[PDB]
Design a protein around this nucleic acid. Structure first.
Ligand SMILES: [Mg+2]
Ligand SMILES: [Mg+2]
Ligand SMILES: [Mg+2]
Ligand SMILES: [Mg+2]
Ligand SMILES: [Mg+2]
Ligand SMILES: [Mg+2]
Ligand SMILES: [Mg+2]
Ligand SMILES: [Mg+2]
Ligand SMILES: [Mg+2]
Ligand SMILES: [Mg+2]
Ligand SMILES: [Mg+2]
Ligand SMILES: [Mg+2]
Ligand SMILES: [Mg+2]
Lengths: 58, 159, 292, 169
RNA sequence: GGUUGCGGCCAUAUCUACCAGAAAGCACCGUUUCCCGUCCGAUCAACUGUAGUUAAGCUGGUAAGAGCCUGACCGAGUAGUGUAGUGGGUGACCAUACGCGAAACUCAGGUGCUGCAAUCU
RNA sequence: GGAGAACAGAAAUCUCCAGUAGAACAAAAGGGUAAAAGCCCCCUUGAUUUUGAUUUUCAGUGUGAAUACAAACCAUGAAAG
RNA sequence: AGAGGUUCCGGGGUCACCUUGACCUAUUCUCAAACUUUAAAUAUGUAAGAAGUCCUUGUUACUUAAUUGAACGUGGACAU
């Protein structure tokens, strides 16, 4: 039975009913995809920084 | 049959920009990309490894990852009724810095300098950009500039 | 000849130095491009170039505005260290590489550490790292356009720069003494080439074969009585002459650059302007069509 | 005019094109080897004709390239066959020239087996000093107009020493 | 200011014809024992800066030059185009209102600029 | 393509000049490529191991294809890579 | 669509000729969804900062010839 195949009518209206949402950026993004050699170092740099700050504060 | 491949409808757009074919000049490789740098995506069609998709050309994103020959760029992509974050592993032949951000940081330096100068004085600075304000009052002189123009022209044909 | 305007319009030139035939950009991209996570770290190359009558060794990094020379040494300042003849030979390439290595190391403050191969024996010795100290200065060889043959004297500057103390990464199989048949090097043949053995044997063979060719070639050796067995002594003395003070004394230039400019401007043709160009065109019209 | 504007031979290239491989072309290699003192190089056919009898990659020719004074020595030994006579043709517009002889006649005969007759092509490439500037790798330039060999220059160099003449039958 | 080495932008740098180049540099150029590579020391390799030369490369200059680049109230506010009307017209299309706005053409100017290092009456 | 070379010419091989790609890259078409990505030579198996991340079709599922890394282990090259 | 350019490039006609085709050069008329040096309008990505900027110097097994950088920080300053 012949009929309508595809249309993008009403899709932008439905898209903008509940708005088009920007992805809500955060401080401290996830390290997913960042270089593993950087990540392994950065874990230790953070651990040493927190160790030195606790030693300087106590 | 419908064709929807990875480089479909990319005939003129990965094309190599008449009389600028050939090798990639060395400043492309000599630029330095850091995490948080905002970069424009324009795919070099001569370099086939690490090409972005045809969606991502023209798009501007923030570098999140820096690797040996590539950078990772976050592009927000409108998918349906929301945006999604797209992490892109693009070799640095398809990436250049964003001059909008370059002049923004020169504006930040200029704003800091003007606020420091206004703190050297005691006066306010008013350091926001303002739009094109309407023009102020003028006195257009006529000396050497007598207003002289005639009417519309007749219809001649000159075929 | 007489190209069409469509040819000239659609023609795309190579860069400038590919046009000039001086730079391999295919090699240059690979030699200059740094790991992007080694963000602003320069990538230094030992540029070794052989003109006629000179050897040029430079330590060159790259910026966008242009290349930047850290330390450069030429073989025509080997007369101040003692080598006055054959300034483009294999041994002069070695001594130029040693000179730029010592000059670079005391420029960086890295010469007391990394003395390099003091007693030279022709061994394939690659500069190793001092434990719990600064690493050796890593410099990659840039030969440019000239071909890699087993025994080319650009690998002389490779060996000299590696022996001076720079960590210049290489393999031993382009040095003289490498056999094609077996995968072993001849350190004694390499050591003869270091101290000019290949010139000395030809000096002692030309005098015994035909004295006419030994008067054409090596006329400068007979001019100031440099005997053929003292070449090793000359190059040996020049090596610690290089090592004792590689500090780059420059020439006095015996003029100033303003006098140089004012004297070389007298022979540089000056471009004409619009007015005399149009006057030449108009006078050409009048003379060529003044009814003869 | 200048000592470096002097026409000198680069190479005499000697060509035997034998439209079949194997024994006949090994004889053709033998005669060029003993004539030149260097081993010749063989040339494969670019494409298949089926009327010339050649096939692709079939080694249907030999040739050798002689430089220095040894080319000048084979020049007279070829020109005596031509009776020191060339033509208005045989001289390129780029200033090269060449001719063709038969029998490789007698000059320096070896043991001389049942080889047969082998004609051959002589081609002489002329230029001046400074021809390295198109052949060297670095700064591979182009020889300027006053220094380029012409047909008039090479026929004047021929109607000079070797004492010959052209176009005369 | 010349020149070299390494370059950045990659024709204002290319191409064609011709002329000039002091000094140094570069180059051609000389040699074939060694390292090495060729059918051929032509290229590549080595050796000598010695026998020679600026002839060429190279550099600069010239041309109502080709090309290229820049600019223009030059074409031209033209073509196209967004928006508007219960506008015109049978229609094709077109005019108007609020906006944006080319290209070819035509003229004028230009014909490499420059970074690091070394050297040169 | 032009000019030349016994047989040899329209076309056999040899030589020179011009040659911005008008060639070639397995296969459609498009893109790309000139000291190359084409042609020839030398060495070789990275067409290997393990695991994440990413892109495109996407519901941001699967499959296919690809991208950039990370720990190895190799190949190549003077080396950068 | 005409102009200019001599050839056993099979124009028949000297046995160098009115009755030469292609080709080459300078022009000429008209075009292209799957042609293009160019190149809009409309639509379209990003940025316009406190998660910011500047100064000092802490951590690291990453990175550098080298605390040289990278990333995250402490402390200080800047809130019409
Ligand atoms: Mg339905
Ligand atoms: Mg399609
Ligand atoms: Mg485009
Ligand atoms: Mg190479
Ligand atoms: Mg030679
Ligand atoms: Mg050489
Ligand atoms: Mg012009
Ligand atoms: Mg010019
Ligand atoms: Mg293919
Ligand atoms: Mg293409
Ligand atoms: Mg290659
Ligand atoms: Mg599929
Ligand atoms: Mg359309």
């Amino acid at each position: 039975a012949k009929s309508k195949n595809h249309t993008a009518h009403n899709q932008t209206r439905k898209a903008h009913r509940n708005g088009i949402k920007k992805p809500k950026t955060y401080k401290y993004p996830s390290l997913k995809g960042v270089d593993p050699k950087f990540r392994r170092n950065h874990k230790h740099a953070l651990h040493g920084t927190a160790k030195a700050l606790a030693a300087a504060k106590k | 049959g419908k064709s929807h491949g990875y480089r479909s409808r990319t005939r003129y757009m990965f094309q190599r920009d008449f009389r600028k074919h050939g090798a990639v000049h060395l400043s492309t490789y000599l630029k330095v990309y850091k995490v948080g740098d905002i970069v424009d995506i324009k795919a070099n069609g001569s370099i086939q490894k690490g090409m972005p998709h045809k969606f991502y050309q023209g798009k501007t994103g923030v570098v999140y990852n820096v690797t040996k020959s590539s950078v990772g760029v976050i592009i927000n992509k409108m998918v349906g009724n929301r945006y999604l974050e797209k992490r892109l592993n693009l070799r640095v032949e398809h990436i250049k810095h964003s001059k909008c951000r370059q002049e923004f940081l020169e504006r930040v330096k200029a704003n800091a300098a003007k606020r420091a100068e206004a703190k050297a004085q005691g006066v306010a600075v008013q350091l926001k950009r303002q739009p094109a304000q309407p023009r102020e009052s003028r006195i257009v002189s006529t000396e050497g500039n007598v207003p002289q123009t005639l009417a519309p022209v007749p219809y001649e044909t000159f075929i | 000849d007489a190209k069409s305007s469509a040819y000239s319009s659609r023609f795309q030139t190579p860069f400038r130095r590919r046009r000039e035939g001086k730079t391999d950009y295919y090699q240059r991209k690979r030699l200059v491009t740094q790991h992007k996570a080694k963000y602003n770290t320069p990538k230094y190359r030992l540029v070794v170039r052989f003109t006629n009558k000179d050897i040029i060794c430079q330590i060159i990094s790259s910026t966008i505005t242009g290349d930047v020379v850290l330390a450069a040494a030429y073989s025509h300042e080997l007369p101040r260290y003692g080598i006055t003849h054959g300034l483009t030979n294999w041994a002069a390439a070695y001594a130029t590489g040693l000179l730029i290595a010592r000059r670079t190391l005391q420029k960086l403050g890295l010469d007391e550490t990394y003395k390099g191969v003091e007693e030279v024996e022709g061994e394939y010795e690659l500069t190793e790292a001092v434990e719990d100290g600064p690493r050796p200065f890593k410099v990659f060889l840039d030969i440019g356009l000239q071909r890699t043959t087993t025994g080319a004297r650009v690998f002389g500057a490779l060996k000299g720069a590696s022996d001076g103390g720079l960590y210049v990464p290489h393999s031993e199989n382009r040095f003289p003494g490498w056999d094609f048949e077996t995968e072993e090097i001849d350190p004694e043949l390499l050591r003869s080439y270091i101290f000019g053995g290949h010139v000395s044997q030809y000096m002692e063979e030309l005098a015994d074969d035909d004295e006419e060719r030994f008067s054409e070639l090596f006329k400068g050796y007979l001019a100031d009585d440099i005997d053929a067995d003292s070449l090793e002594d000359i190059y040996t003395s020049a090596h610690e002459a290089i090592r004792a003070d590689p500090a780059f004394k420059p020439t006095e230039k015996k003029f100033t650059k303003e006098q140089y400019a004012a004297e070389s401007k007298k022979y540089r043709q000056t471009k004409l302007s619009k007015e005399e160009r149009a006057a030449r065109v108009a006078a050409k019209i009048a003379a060529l069509a003044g009814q003869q | 005019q200048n000592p470096m504007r002097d026409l000198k031979i680069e190479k005499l290239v000697l060509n035997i094109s034998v439209g079949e491989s194997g024994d006949r072309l090994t004889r053709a290699s033998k005669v060029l080897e003993q004539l030149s003192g260097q081993t010749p190089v063989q040339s494969k056919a670019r494409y298949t004709v089926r009327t010339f009898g050649i096939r692709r990659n079939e080694k249907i020719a030999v040739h050798v390239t002689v430089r220095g004074p040894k080319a000048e020595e084979i020049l007279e030994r070829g020109l005596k066959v031509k009776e020191y006579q060339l033509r208005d043709r045989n001289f390129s517009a780029t200033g090269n020239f060449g001719f063709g002889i038969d029998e490789h006649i007698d000059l320096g005969i070896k043991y001389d087996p049942s080889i047969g007759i082998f004609g051959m092509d002589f081609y002489v490439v002329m230029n001046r000093p400074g021809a390295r500037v198109t052949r060297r790798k670095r700064c591979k330039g182009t020889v300027g107009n006053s220094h380029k060999t012409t047909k008039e220059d090479t026929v004047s160099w021929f109607k000079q020493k070797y004492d010959a003449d052209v176009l005369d039958k």
